[PDB]
Protein backbone atom coordinates (compact mmCIF):
# COMPACT_ATOMS: atom_id res chain seq x y z
CA UNK A 1 0.00 0.00 0.00
CA UNK A 2 1.21 3.49 -0.87
CA UNK A 3 1.51 6.24 1.69
CA UNK A 4 -1.05 8.43 3.36
CA UNK A 5 1.18 11.28 2.12
CA UNK A 6 -0.85 11.55 -1.06
CA UNK A 7 -2.83 9.32 -3.37
CA UNK A 8 -1.65 8.91 -6.94
CA UNK A 9 -3.33 9.87 -10.19
CA UNK A 10 -1.59 10.80 -13.43
CA UNK A 11 -1.80 14.24 -14.95
CA UNK A 12 -2.86 13.21 -18.44
CA UNK A 13 -5.99 11.60 -16.97
CA UNK A 14 -6.63 14.19 -14.24
CA UNK A 15 -6.89 16.80 -16.99
CA UNK A 16 -9.27 14.62 -19.00
CA UNK A 17 -11.61 13.87 -16.10
CA UNK A 18 -11.84 17.49 -14.99
CA UNK A 19 -12.33 18.61 -18.58
CA UNK A 20 -15.09 16.04 -19.13
CA UNK A 21 -17.13 16.57 -15.96
CA UNK A 22 -18.69 19.88 -17.02
CA UNK A 23 -19.23 18.90 -20.65
CA UNK A 24 -21.54 16.10 -19.48
CA UNK A 25 -21.53 12.37 -20.06
CA UNK A 26 -20.22 11.20 -23.42
CA UNK A 27 -18.51 8.26 -25.08
CA UNK A 28 -16.22 6.45 -22.61
CA UNK A 29 -12.95 8.20 -21.82
CA UNK A 30 -10.20 6.00 -23.23
CA UNK A 31 -7.06 5.46 -21.17
CA UNK A 32 -3.98 3.34 -20.53
CA UNK A 33 -3.36 4.54 -16.97
CA UNK A 34 -4.31 1.40 -15.10
CA UNK A 35 -2.23 2.58 -12.17
CA UNK A 36 -4.17 5.74 -11.28
CA UNK A 37 -6.55 5.65 -8.33
CA UNK A 38 -10.24 6.58 -8.58
CA UNK A 39 -11.46 9.96 -7.25
CA UNK A 40 -14.94 11.01 -6.10
CA UNK A 41 -14.97 13.35 -9.09
CA UNK A 42 -15.13 10.31 -11.36
CA UNK A 43 -18.47 8.92 -10.19
CA UNK A 44 -20.93 8.32 -12.99
CA UNK A 45 -18.32 8.45 -15.73
CA UNK A 46 -17.58 5.59 -18.10
CA UNK A 47 -13.89 4.84 -18.62
CA UNK A 48 -12.38 2.37 -21.07
CA UNK A 49 -9.39 0.85 -19.30
CA UNK A 50 -6.61 -1.00 -21.08
CA UNK A 51 -6.07 -4.71 -20.53
CA UNK A 52 -3.17 -5.26 -22.89
CA UNK A 53 -5.20 -5.57 -26.09
CA UNK A 54 -8.64 -3.97 -25.59
CA UNK A 55 -10.29 -1.09 -23.75
CA UNK A 56 -12.90 -2.73 -21.53
CA UNK A 57 -15.55 -0.22 -20.34
CA UNK A 58 -16.14 0.32 -16.62
CA UNK A 59 -18.87 2.60 -15.29
CA UNK A 60 -17.62 4.24 -12.11
CA UNK A 61 -19.96 4.18 -9.12
CA UNK A 62 -19.59 5.40 -5.55
CA UNK A 63 -18.26 2.15 -4.11
CA UNK A 64 -15.28 1.87 -6.48
CA UNK A 65 -13.50 4.88 -4.96
CA UNK A 66 -9.96 4.52 -3.68
CA UNK A 67 -9.40 1.47 -5.85
CA UNK A 68 -6.87 1.57 -8.65
CA UNK A 69 -8.35 1.71 -12.12
CA UNK A 70 -6.60 -1.47 -13.22
CA UNK A 71 -8.47 -3.91 -11.01
CA UNK A 72 -11.62 -3.63 -13.11
CA UNK A 73 -9.90 -4.97 -16.25
CA UNK A 74 -8.40 -8.48 -15.92
CA UNK A 75 -5.42 -9.15 -18.16
CA UNK A 76 -5.66 -12.95 -18.32
CA UNK A 77 -8.41 -15.11 -19.81
CA UNK A 78 -9.09 -18.50 -18.25
CA UNK A 79 -11.95 -20.91 -18.97
CA UNK A 80 -11.18 -24.32 -17.38
CA UNK A 81 -8.84 -27.13 -18.36
CA UNK A 82 -11.21 -29.78 -19.70
Amino acid sequence: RSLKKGPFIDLHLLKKVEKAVESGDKKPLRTWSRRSTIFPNMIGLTIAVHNGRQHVPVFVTDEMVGHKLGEFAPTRTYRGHA
Partner: protein, 101 residues
Protein backbone atom coordinates in the same frame (compact mmCIF):
# COMPACT_ATOMS: atom_id res chain seq x y z
CA UNK B 1 24.54 -7.63 -27.34
CA UNK B 2 22.24 -6.11 -29.95
CA UNK B 3 23.77 -2.61 -30.26
CA UNK B 4 20.28 -1.14 -29.96
CA UNK B 5 20.36 -2.23 -26.31
CA UNK B 6 23.78 -0.64 -25.84
CA UNK B 7 22.37 2.58 -27.28
CA UNK B 8 19.48 2.53 -24.83
CA UNK B 9 21.76 2.33 -21.80
CA UNK B 10 23.99 5.22 -22.81
CA UNK B 11 20.93 7.34 -23.55
CA UNK B 12 19.45 6.54 -20.15
CA UNK B 13 22.64 7.52 -18.34
CA UNK B 14 22.89 10.82 -20.21
CA UNK B 15 19.22 11.54 -19.56
CA UNK B 16 19.58 10.78 -15.84
CA UNK B 17 22.53 13.07 -15.14
CA UNK B 18 20.85 16.00 -16.89
CA UNK B 19 17.43 16.14 -15.23
CA UNK B 20 17.90 14.39 -11.89
CA UNK B 21 20.75 14.66 -9.37
CA UNK B 22 19.81 18.34 -9.53
CA UNK B 23 16.05 18.13 -10.07
CA UNK B 24 15.73 15.69 -7.19
CA UNK B 25 14.71 18.49 -4.85
CA UNK B 26 11.08 18.29 -5.93
CA UNK B 27 10.90 14.64 -4.87
CA UNK B 28 12.64 15.30 -1.55
CA UNK B 29 12.08 18.79 -0.13
CA UNK B 30 8.50 19.13 -1.33
CA UNK B 31 7.52 15.53 -0.55
CA UNK B 32 8.52 16.46 3.00
CA UNK B 33 6.61 16.70 6.28
CA UNK B 34 5.67 20.36 6.70
CA UNK B 35 2.74 22.74 6.27
CA UNK B 36 2.95 22.44 2.46
CA UNK B 37 0.14 19.86 2.51
CA UNK B 38 -1.60 22.29 0.16
CA UNK B 39 -1.02 22.34 -3.60
CA UNK B 40 2.67 22.89 -2.81
CA UNK B 41 3.12 19.16 -2.28
CA UNK B 42 0.39 18.08 -4.70
CA UNK B 43 1.78 20.02 -7.65
CA UNK B 44 5.27 18.61 -7.18
CA UNK B 45 3.88 15.08 -7.21
CA UNK B 46 1.96 15.96 -10.36
CA UNK B 47 5.02 17.60 -11.92
CA UNK B 48 7.28 14.59 -11.36
CA UNK B 49 5.32 12.57 -13.92
CA UNK B 50 5.80 15.19 -16.63
CA UNK B 51 9.52 14.51 -16.66
CA UNK B 52 10.70 11.85 -19.13
CA UNK B 53 9.95 8.28 -18.12
CA UNK B 54 13.72 7.76 -18.08
CA UNK B 55 16.29 9.76 -16.08
CA UNK B 56 15.12 7.79 -13.10
CA UNK B 57 18.30 6.10 -11.80
CA UNK B 58 16.19 3.02 -11.04
CA UNK B 59 16.00 2.30 -14.78
CA UNK B 60 19.63 1.58 -15.72
CA UNK B 61 20.28 -2.15 -15.94
CA UNK B 62 24.04 -1.85 -15.32
CA UNK B 63 25.30 -3.91 -18.25
CA UNK B 64 28.81 -5.16 -18.93
CA UNK B 65 31.25 -2.75 -20.53
CA UNK B 66 32.82 -5.02 -23.12
CA UNK B 67 29.71 -6.99 -24.12
CA UNK B 68 26.55 -5.43 -22.71
CA UNK B 69 25.61 -8.62 -20.92
CA UNK B 70 22.71 -7.85 -18.56
CA UNK B 71 23.27 -10.74 -16.14
CA UNK B 72 26.18 -11.72 -13.93
CA UNK B 73 27.57 -8.25 -13.30
CA UNK B 74 30.40 -7.45 -10.89
CA UNK B 75 30.52 -3.84 -9.70
CA UNK B 76 34.15 -3.94 -8.54
CA UNK B 77 35.32 -4.52 -12.13
CA UNK B 78 32.35 -3.43 -14.22
CA UNK B 79 32.57 -6.62 -16.29
CA UNK B 80 30.41 -9.72 -16.47
CA UNK B 81 31.37 -13.06 -14.93
CA UNK B 82 32.67 -14.26 -18.31
CA UNK B 83 34.99 -11.39 -19.17
CA UNK B 84 36.41 -11.00 -15.67
CA UNK B 85 37.70 -14.57 -15.67
CA UNK B 86 39.07 -14.20 -19.18
CA UNK B 87 40.88 -10.96 -18.34
CA UNK B 88 41.89 -12.10 -14.86
CA UNK B 89 43.59 -15.09 -16.37
CA UNK B 90 45.85 -13.30 -18.85
CA UNK B 91 46.91 -10.89 -16.11
CA UNK B 92 45.06 -7.67 -16.96
CA UNK B 93 43.62 -7.25 -13.44
CA UNK B 94 46.27 -6.24 -10.87
CA UNK B 95 46.41 -8.17 -7.63
CA UNK B 96 43.86 -10.77 -8.69
CA UNK B 97 44.83 -14.43 -8.49
CA UNK B 98 43.47 -17.86 -7.68
CA UNK B 99 42.43 -18.10 -4.04
CA UNK B 100 42.85 -21.23 -1.95
CA UNK B 101 42.30 -21.43 1.78
Amino acid sequence: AKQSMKAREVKRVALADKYFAKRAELKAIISDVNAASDEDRWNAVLKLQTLPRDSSPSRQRNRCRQTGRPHGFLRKFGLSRIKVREAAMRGEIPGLKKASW
